Amino acid sequence: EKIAIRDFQVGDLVLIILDERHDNYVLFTVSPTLYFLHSESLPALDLKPRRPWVLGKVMEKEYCQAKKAQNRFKVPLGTKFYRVKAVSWN
Amino acid sequence: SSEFEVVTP
Ligand SMILES: [Mg+2]
């Protein structure tokens, strides 16, 4: 039970945590870059759109750029962030 | 959405 904390690659066991400032689930990381959990992943991890944290396995990642000021991620315009799909550890 | 686009690192 050891987790990656930055430079997430496919196959990494990761810690998925609720981020209330951004009102989404994110990968726990020491990097300043935001790794949002892809919304497709929520049922697979039994998270609804209150559980504080879960372990997951990274399976896909996507590099994105906010193109409007108000967005579902609550990040400023132009911000660049990742979207990650993850499944349950075991 | 048009909120965000995929971009190459
Ligand atoms: Mg982690």
Side-chain angles (χ1 to χ4, degrees), chain A residues 7-20 22-25:
Chain A
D7 315 318
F8 306 109
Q9 310 291 324
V10 166
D12 285 346
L13 194 54
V14 287
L15 178 65
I16 291 152
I17 69 162
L18 171 62
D19 178 6
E20 262 180 79
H22 295 110
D23 203 67
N24 279 251
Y25 281 103

Side-chain angles (χ1 to χ4, degrees), chain A residues 19-20 22-47 49 51-70:
Chain A
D19 178 6
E20 262 180 79
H22 295 110
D23 203 67
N24 279 251
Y25 281 103
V26 304
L27 277 55
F28 170 81
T29 183
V30 305
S31 153
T33 314
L34 288 166
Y35 284 76
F36 286 102
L37 182 74
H38 197 303
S39 75
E40 263 194 30
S41 293
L42 291 189
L45 294 167
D46 201 50
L47 311 162
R51 193 173 246 145
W53 61 266
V54 70
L55 294 178
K57 201 169 91 196
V58 161
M59 290 279 96
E60 194 166 280
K61 73 179 187 277
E62 182 176 67
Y63 195 43
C64 306
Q65 182 171 47
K67 273 296 209 104
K68 47 162 68 135
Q70 40 274 326

